[PDB]
Amino acid sequence: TMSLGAENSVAYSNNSIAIPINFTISVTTEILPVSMTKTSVDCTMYICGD
């Protein structure tokens, strides 16, 4: 049976805040399709042909 992720009790209380001391600049790659091959088919030559 699959595990959805590590469990984490967030350390919440009504007067505690966590502030980041430091950072990392992250570069992430996203790929997106934009076009197909522009195929076109002659219906008479496909069906019959000569």
Partner: protein, 50 residues
């Protein structure tokens, strides 16, 4: 068939008579009189646009 017949570098085995593309399409032949292998390429076609 109908096509532009041309000389070719293909080496059929001694019993083989036709050659086929991935898409079944016959793309070479052996002449039964002088046992050379000919490529078949289709006669030129395409849309005409004004």
């Amino acid at each position: 068939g109908t096509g532009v017949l041309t000389e070719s570098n293909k080496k059929f085995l001694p019993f083989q008579q036709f050659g086929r593309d991935i898409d079944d399409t016959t793309d070479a032949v052996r002449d039964p009189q002088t046992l050379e292998i000919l490529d078949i390429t289709p006669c030129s076609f395409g849309g005409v646009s004004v």
